[PDB]
Paper text:
SARS-CoV-2 spike protein plays a key role in mediating viral entry and inducing host immune responses. It can adopt either an open or closed conformation based on the position of its receptor-binding domain (RBD). On newly packaged virus particles, the trimeric spike protein has a pre-fusion structure in which three receptor-binding S1 subunits sit on top of a trimeric membrane-fusion S2 stalk. During viral entry, a receptor-binding domain (RBD) in S1 binds to a receptor on host cell surface for viral attachment and S2 switches to a post-fusion structure for the fusion of viral and host membranes.
To this end, we introduced the K417V mutation into SARS-CoV-2 spike ectodomain and purified both versions of the protein: K417-spike containing Lys417 and V417-spike containing Val417. To stabilize the recombinant spike ectodomain, we introduced six proline mutations into its S2 subunit to lock up its pre-fusion structure, introduced mutations to its furin motif to prevent it from being cleaved during molecular maturation, and added a C-terminal foldon tag to facilitate its trimerization. Further 3D refinements using the good particles generated a 3.2 Å map for the closed spike and a 3.9 Å map for the open spike. The structure of SARS-CoV-2 RBD complexed with human ACE2 showed that Lys417 in SARS-CoV-2 RBD is directly involved in ACE2 binding by forming a salt bridge with Asp30 in human ACE2. Simultaneously, Lys417’s direct interaction with human ACE2 boosts ACE2 binding and viral entry, counteracting the limitations of the closed spike. Our study shows that, compared to its closed form, the open spike is more effective at binding to ACE2 and facilitating viral entry.
Author numbering:
A (entry chain B): 825 to 834, 850 to 872
B (entry chain A): 292 to 340
C (entry chain B), G (entry chain C): 728 to 776
D (entry chain B): 922 to 1066
E (entry chain B): 14 to 69, 77 to 244, 254 to 291
F (entry chain A): 534 to 622, 633 to 676
H (entry chain C): 970 to 1018
I (entry chain B): 534 to 582
Write the structure that this text describes.
């Protein structure tokens, strides 16, 4: 049910001017663990 | 400009650095050559007349 | 909710790309980009915390 | 009888989430807000700010270094001000999210790991127990009461 | 030579609702599935527009003002409207723009003319050879000082045709900014009696001209001895542009699909 | 030229980036192409009719990993967000004894092991780095 | 305490109070007034919540 | 704010537009930054409440 | 005229608004009247006092 609002604006996704998004330290899977 | 450890000393302004992760020295691939493109222009001025 | 998305901003490439004279104009403004990266670094740490 | 009521309630929970699409809104908008915040950050790149152009090269390729500092100074001031606004908003929003996360951790430590007597802390009615479920950027408690 | 035509039917002017017509691409940047807002000169939705028609008894060709671009639409059969005049005074006190869709050529020029009271072009009606030969070109009295001309490739087009419903829906909009004439247009096959349809249609950019003159008034030109005539039915509609602010939506292939007035 | 980061001028449109043959279907009068960000990413070549995708060539921040200077003087480097097939663009830690690929990017200066312990220095994606025998 | 009074400040009528050239010269500054109105309306909704 | 006056209409009553813009830039800067201060302080107080 | 939204011009001092009769008991050396925000709110008509 959860979807992001804009596609490409939350693997090659580097923004054109200096915007980066850091992956979380804990991934999806071990939280479920 | 010598080594990453010295880069940490240079940007944290200390001769001691404790354990962890730090963020320095943002980079860019720095493109090689130049290029220009323009239409195939053919309508000359008749100077021969 | 638990956390937002961590994000980070390179100050100089945000402000002006490729213009070293813009960097010369920027470097008289003190150390603002250090503050900016420090604040975003603190937020990004607190997310995982 | 309790087993039948419990299983029926769980099936109704599945049906209630699979039916109503407006349930996860408390998670969603935060993400949306961050998105549009980043979005409007990009939209401040293409302002004039009283300078002649928003293209930095075109100012450089038309106006001379005896005078071009005046225009690029305006561009510096405008873009720096936009960064100020963006990160002040981010700090306030992050403090708010931290407060909600502390509330979540308290709920996980009391409602799940034990049995609290605080009325309406762990949902409506007399609290029996809780189960947690993971969620994108969040947690979902199922209180059994 | 140019004569005054008098024998007609007299009627008051008519207005028609321009429902949602007259949208054009503001630039040449391609988008895909994008809601983007602009602000520019546009024809407002649901205005009333001037409706003129040549029937049977009608030769309705006056001089109209040109301010901030105009939108011109025509429902026609067999291409009776041929020309456009532009200029401040049309009488060699100011420069003058001449656009002609000849049966042979299309002629585009600016010189310093003196146009007549009723400039028009006259074609005969089935002169024993099943061809309508164009015989009369009565536009200006002279061409004093010339500054720019252009003529395209010659061609042939049909000067004859009779239909119970007009097939040609030709849509144009003309703008003048900083010495530049902008002609934006669209052609459409259509089946309607005496009206303009409801629907969406963008205008592709077609022509820019770097002319550099002041333009205030204009008039179009019609196809048809000095009295005695035979013209087919045609009709056109004239609307004016106002600076407005719109929202436009682009599909995946990048055509403007629908528009929103603010 | 193609497949390299270059700075370019297409008909008064200057920029920098790597160019790619594209699949976008222009209308014939259309020249540029933009984003939702109103940033140019699609340019039609004036000489020959084709669509060119523009990608800004890559970049990133440098992460540096160390124990304390009371402990050691050996460090490691993370190039974030980069499949490090083009790493070297100091230089001495550009080809040193291994490269390791993570969801964060390229790790250089640490050797990947199989065992799993508790986290020491949080790098990311469940990956942590430490100093041991 | 429970809430405060909900306030609203119109950006344009505050800054360029009934001037046309001032609005036009304001227009080059991006989209501040939208951000300010959005923040204030969010506060005012939050009070009733 | 360093300009001739703080009255908007008087400057337009006396100056040509190529200098009215010079004054009104400084005026719009001062007023805008004051409004920025006000909205930030309001956000902090709303979070406290 | 009174009681209409109009443009007004008193001694070069101009503005837009509605004029009504006051009861402010001036002293003869005074002409104008000001507000907290340095805006004109009470004007002596030059022709009729
Ligand atoms: C708006 C439009 O016509 N889009 C077309 C789509 O219908 C077609 O299926 C596809 C196949 O390449 O190409 C595109
Ligand atoms: C491909 C690879 O790394 N394989 C290793 C294996 O050699 C090692 O024995 C084991 C630990 O028991 O972990 C795994
Ligand atoms: C106080 C005073 O001098 N009032 C005069 C008035 O008597 C005269 O009729 C009018 C004509 O312009 O000008 C004013
Ligand atoms: C437009 O003209 C028509 C002509 O009949 C008239 O009925 C209508 O009221 C007019 N609308 C406006 C907005 O002027």
């Amino acid at each position: 049910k959860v979807t992001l609002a804009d596609a490409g604006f939350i693997i090659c996704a580097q923004k054109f001017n200096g915007l980066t998004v850091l992956p979380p330290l804990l991934t999806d899977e071990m939280i479920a663990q | 400009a010598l080594d990453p450890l010295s880069e940490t000393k240079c940007t944290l302004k200390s001769f001691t650095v404790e354990k962890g992760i730090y963020q320095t020295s943002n980079f860019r691939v720095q493109p090689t050559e130049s290029i220009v493109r323009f239409p195939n222009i053919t309508n000359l001025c008749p100077f021969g007349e | 909710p638990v956390s937002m998305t961590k994000t980070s901003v390179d100050c100089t490439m945000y402000i002006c790309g490729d213009s070293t004279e813009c960097s010369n104009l920027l470097l008289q403004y003190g150390s603002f980009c250090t503050q900016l990266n420090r604040a975003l670094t603190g937020i990004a740490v607190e997310q995982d915390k | 009888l309790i087993a039948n009521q419990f299983n029926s309630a769980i099936g109704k929970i599945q049906d209630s989430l699979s039916s109503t699409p407006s349930a996860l809104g408390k998670l969603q908008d935060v993400v949306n807000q961050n998105a549009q915040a980043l979005n409007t950050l990009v939209k401040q790149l293409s302002s004039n700010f009283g300078a002649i152009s928003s293209v930095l090269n075109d100012i450089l390729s038309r106006l001379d270094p005896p005078e071009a500092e005046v225009q690029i100074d305006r561009l510096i001031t405008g873009r720096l001000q936009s960064l100020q606004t963006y990160v002040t908003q981010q700090l306030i929003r992050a403090a708010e999210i931290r407060a909600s996360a502390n509330l979540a951790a308290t709920k996980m430590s009391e409602c799940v790991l034990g049995q609290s007597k605080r009325v309406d802390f762990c949902g409506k009615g007399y609290h029996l127990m809780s189960f947690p479920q993971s969620a994108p950027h969040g947690v979902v408690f199922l209180h059994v009461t | 030579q140019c004569v005054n035509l008098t024998t007609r039917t007299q009627l008051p002017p008519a207005y028609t609702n321009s429902f949602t017509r007259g949208v054009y691409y503001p630039d040449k940047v391609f988008r895909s599935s994008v809601l983007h807002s602009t602000q520019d000169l546009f024809l407002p939705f649901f205005s009333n527009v001037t409706w003129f028609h040549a029937i049977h008894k009608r030769f309705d060709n006056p001089v109209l003002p040109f301010n901030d671009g105009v939108y011109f639409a025509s429902t026609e059969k067999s291409n009776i409207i041929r020309g456009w005049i532009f200029g401040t005074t049309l009488d060699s006190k100011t420069q003058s723009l001449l656009i002609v869709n000849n049966a042979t050529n299309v002629v585009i020029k600016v010189c310093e003319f003196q146009f007549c009271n009723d400039p028009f072009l006259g074609v005969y009606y089935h002169k024993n050879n099943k061809s309508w030969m164009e015989s009369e070109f009565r536009v200006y009295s002279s061409a004093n000082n010339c500054t720019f001309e252009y003529v395209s490739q010659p061609f042939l087009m049909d000067l004859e045709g009779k239909q119970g419903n007009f097939k040609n829906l030709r849509e144009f909009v003309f703008k003048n900014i900083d010495g530049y004439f902008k002609i934006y247009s669209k052609h459409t096959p259509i089946n309607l009696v005496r009206d303009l349809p409801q629907g969406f249609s963008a205008l592709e950019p077609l022509v820019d001209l770097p002319i550099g003159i002041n333009i205030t008034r204009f008039q179009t030109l019609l196809a048809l001895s000095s009295s005695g005539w035979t013209a087919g039915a045609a009709a056109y509609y004239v609307g004016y542009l106002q600076p407005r602010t719109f929202l436009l939506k682009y599909n995946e292939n990048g055509t403007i699909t629908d528009a929103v007035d603010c | 030229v193609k497949n390299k980061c270059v700075n370019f001028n297409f008909n008064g449109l200057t920029g920098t980036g790597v160019l790619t043959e594209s699949n976008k279907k222009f209308l014939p009068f259309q020249q540029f192409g933009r984003d939702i960000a109103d940033t140019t990413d699609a340019v039609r070549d004036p000489q020959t009719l084709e669509i060119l995708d523009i990608t800004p060539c890559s970049f990133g921040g440098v992460s540096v990993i160390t124990p304390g200077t009371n402990t050691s003087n050996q460090v490691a480097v993370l190039y974030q967000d980069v499949n490090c097939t083009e790493v070297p663009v100091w230089r001495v830690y550009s080809t040193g004894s291994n490269v390791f690929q993570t969801r964060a990017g390229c790790l250089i200066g640490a050797e990947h092991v199989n065992n799993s312990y508790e986290c020491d220095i949080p790098i990311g994606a469940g990956i942590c780095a430490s100093y041991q025998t």
